[PDB]
Design an enzyme around this catalytic site. Structure first.
Site, short mmCIF file in Angstrom:
data_model
loop_
_atom_site.label_atom_id
_atom_site.label_comp_id
_atom_site.label_asym_id
_atom_site.label_seq_id
_atom_site.Cartn_x
_atom_site.Cartn_y
_atom_site.Cartn_z
N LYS A 59 6.74 1.20 -3.73
CA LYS A 59 6.77 -0.25 -3.87
C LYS A 59 5.87 -0.67 -5.02
CE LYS A 59 8.01 -1.27 0.90
NZ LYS A 59 7.50 -1.68 2.24
N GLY A 105 0.82 -1.20 0.00
CA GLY A 105 0.00 0.00 0.00
C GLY A 105 0.86 1.25 0.00
N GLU A 106 2.09 1.11 -0.47
CA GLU A 106 3.05 2.21 -0.53
C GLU A 106 3.40 2.49 -1.99
OE1 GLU A 106 6.27 1.42 2.54
OE2 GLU A 106 5.04 -0.39 2.67
N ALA A 107 3.34 3.77 -2.36
CA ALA A 107 3.58 4.21 -3.72
C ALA A 107 4.86 3.73 -4.40
CB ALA A 107 3.51 5.72 -3.79
#
Length: 356
Positions: free
Chosen positions: A108, A104-106
């Site tokens: 990644k 949920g991280e940009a």
């Protein structure tokens, strides 16, 4: 297409170790590969595919999408082991995205999309000019999926096939993508949305709530993103006076897709301790997949004392931490204890010694 015999033999020990602490599982695989002279990166990737039903897929996705050199090599092997030959561009991308419990991280998410784009091109050189062209097509298609399927976006305001063609002009390595190719891509994603399964929590400390935007620290942090020559200690008084910062501005498509506003990297020039702080603010597009609340994700680096730096930043917010999750290097208990210790310190600074 199969794990090495020595890996298969120890599959249970590897699985057990990995799920408890990913780093230990990875190390076990590497130890076996060393002993039997096996290429480690391809073996780790093959194990992820082979044991997908037995492994913590959030952890697998996190490992694969990490920035470290080893992780990136494993991801390349992992994606190369997938067969995209025979599938259209949209179907290949759909298959790829559905394979993960997506981070949920940009940054990644971005790395995963870049891996697909490179592999797609390698396996389908006749479709796009280069890997960069495949990447553009991939993230544009991901944005289009939200644009077309997010109920909050009025039908009259949704991108049209003509709009897609106009916006992608010159996107195919300076040239254009075939008109009929784009018309097909548009129709495919409009007719069948992507299957996107994101992790519910991310590594480190996450602050997120319906009132976080009113938090004084959040406000200073948000402003810091576009500041120049400002010491981070003005945002986090707790940290030292020797903390330097660099800010990674957000790619426009990541801002659209996730609400990403950038990542600030804090580094103590004396202890080398490091911590990253990601900021997300909701917009009409991102809310469809990431909710209506702003988010701050704080993660300690691998260097010593990083845990205390990250904990101090998290503890400086009046707002509570919604979720605590282990990182590849630190157990969740250590993150919680460090954070609680910093909160206790603040309590004593404000109330003096505990009464007895």
């Amino acid at each position: 297409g199969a794990s090495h015999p020595e890996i298969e033999k120890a599959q249970r020990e590897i699985i057990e170790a990995f799920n408890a602490k990913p780093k230990n599982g990875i190390n076990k695989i590497k130890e076996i590969c060393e002993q039997y002279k096996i290429s480690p990166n391809e073996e780790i990737a093959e194990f992820f595919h082979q044991q997908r039903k037995n492994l913590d897929l959030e952890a697998v996705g996190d490992y694969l999408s990490s920035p470290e050199a080893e992780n990136q090599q494993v991801l390349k092997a992992f994606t190369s082991q997938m067969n995209f030959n025979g599938q259209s561009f949209v179907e290949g991308l759909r298959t790829f995205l559905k394979t993960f419990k997506l981070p949920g991280e940009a940054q990644k998410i971005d790395r995963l999309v870049q891996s697909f784009s490179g592999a797609y091109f390698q396996q389908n050189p006749d479709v796009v000019s280069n890997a960069d062209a495949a990447y553009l097509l991939a993230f544009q298609t991901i944005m289009l999926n939200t644009d077309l399927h997010n109920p909050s976006i009025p039908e009259k305001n949704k991108m049209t096939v003509d709009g897609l063609k106009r916006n992608l002009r010159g996107g195919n390595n300076g040239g254009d993508f075939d008109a009929k190719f784009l018309e097909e891509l548009y129709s495919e994603i409009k007719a069948k949305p992507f299957e996107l399964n994101f992790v519910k929590t991310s590594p480190g400390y996450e602050l997120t709530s319906t009132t976080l935007n009113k938090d004084s620290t959040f406000k200073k942090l948000d402003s810091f993103l576009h500041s120049t020559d400002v010491n981070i200690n003005t945002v986090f008084p707790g940290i030292g006076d020797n903390v330097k910062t660099t800010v990674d501005q957000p790619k426009s498509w990541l801002s659209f897709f996730t609400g990403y506003k950038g990542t600030i990297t804090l580094t103590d020039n004396k202890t080398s301790a490091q911590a990253t702080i990601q900021v997300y603010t909701p917009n009409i597009f991102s809310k469809w997949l990431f909710g209506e609340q702003p988010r701050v994700i704080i993660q300690p680096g691998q260097t010593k004392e990083s845990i205390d730096l990250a904990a101090k930043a998290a503890a400086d917010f009046s707002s509570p931490v919604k979720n605590f999750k282990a990182t590849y290097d630190y157990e969740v208990g250590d993150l919680i204890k460090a954070y609680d210790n910093q909160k206790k310190l603040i309590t004593i600074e404000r109330n003096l010694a505990l009464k007895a």
